[PDB]
């Protein structure tokens, strides 16, 4: 409704004041009760999901500011992309991510690139350039003490509602803006991925969800606040698994908005969960990786959450653009070589344009004191969006 004022998607909701659902919110029904039926409907539902996530847990994601400039220099195989961002009131900040390049002549359209939060913890293939993004500089993340601290807040103000992870997303968007105006960086901006591990994996998921120029999203062992769902993690903690959950996470750090504190004890009233956050990547590609050795990561919650999110790609007819691999037997953020084929399949297909098959959806079902029962959490029937 009200398309003449708001555009093609009309008056998307940012709140649902009467919501109360202990199971997972339905991806395929808008807040107003309209059912999704077409693939185009997904674009508008994703916009509504973005507004709901910002309202309840992420804070405000500012749009591109009126000043974004960039200069590039290179020494050896290392480029430095010096970025400046500024507001209409003259306030400016600067940050300078570095890029590690393969040697020699690039492909005609430039190197594919993975934006790696704090360098990431995945093996990046030799034909893909790596941009090291210091997300902690953009928004600090030591503990609850870090609230409102970081370069982002030196631009927008320390009381700005963006969570640290939303601030990190904004920084990624500026990096891509910079790359698109800097041909000498020799990056194929149509083949950019994002990755990070642990808290930086929560960050990478947020980046892929909210920044649509990311072609491939790779969250690694992101746990609670990442590819796990709040409702499922509450079920785990109530049944004796020592998981991270919504209540603890908001006291531990600043990855979520202060407003989320008002909902962590009332999760059924939140008209979203992280299955909808992950689904915001669709129709682009994502594979996330989880580790069952650490109950803190909430293993069942990630499997159930990603199974729920997967229904969006299934409804869009592109199930193989979304992968999930969950295994045990390795240290946190250590990369197990047994998963390298799955990682490379997604990188090869979505960043390197190879005909790799990307049907990856596997778990060992090692969930501790709980089991996954899809009927207790997913109530919707996946439509075939037209
Ligand atoms: C319900 O909301 C969606 C998203 O704003 C919109 O596209 C749709 O037109 C709305 N339904 C009606 C009947 O206005």
Author numbering: 73 to 458
What text comes from the article?
A common type of LCC in hardwood is the ester-LCC formed between α-1,2-linked 4-O-methyl-d-glucuronoyl moieties of acetylated glucuronoxylan and γ-alcohols in lignin. It was recently discovered that an insoluble hardwood lignin-preparation (LRP) is amenable to enzymatic hydrolysis by a glucuronoyl esterase (GE, EC 3.1.1.B11) releasing aldouronic acids. WT CuGE has a modular architecture with a N-terminal carbohydrate-binding module 1 (CBM1) domain connected to the catalytic domain by a proline-rich linker region. The overall fold of the catalytic domain of CuGE features a large ten-stranded twisted β-sheet flanked by α-helical elements and a surface-exposed active site. The structure complies with the characteristics of a serine esterase belonging to the α/β-hydrolase superfamily.
To enable structural and functional studies two different variants were constructed, ΔWT, comprises residues 78–458 lacking the carbohydrate-binding domain (CBM1), and ΔS270A an inactive variant of ΔWT where the catalytic serine is replaced with an alanine. For the structural studies, WT and ΔS270A were enzymatically deglycosylated to obtain homogeneous samples, named dWT and dΔS270A, respectively. The structure of the inactive truncated variant, apo-dΔS270A was determined to 1.46 Å resolution. Nevertheless, molecule A and B superimpose well with an RMSD of 0.32 Å for 359 aligned Cα atoms (apo-dΔS270A). In apo-dΔS270A Y366 adopts a unique conformation in molecule B (pH 7.5–8) that seems to be incompatible with substrate binding, but identifies Y366 as a structurally flexible element. The inactive variant ΔS270A is destabilized by ca 3 °C compared to variants with an intact catalytic triad, implying that some stabilizing interactions have been lost, but the overall conclusion is that CuGE is a highly stable enzyme with Ti’s in the range of 72.2–75.8 °C for all variants. The high-resolution structure of the catalytic domain (dΔS270A) obtained from the crystal structure determinations (described in detail later) matched the solution structure.
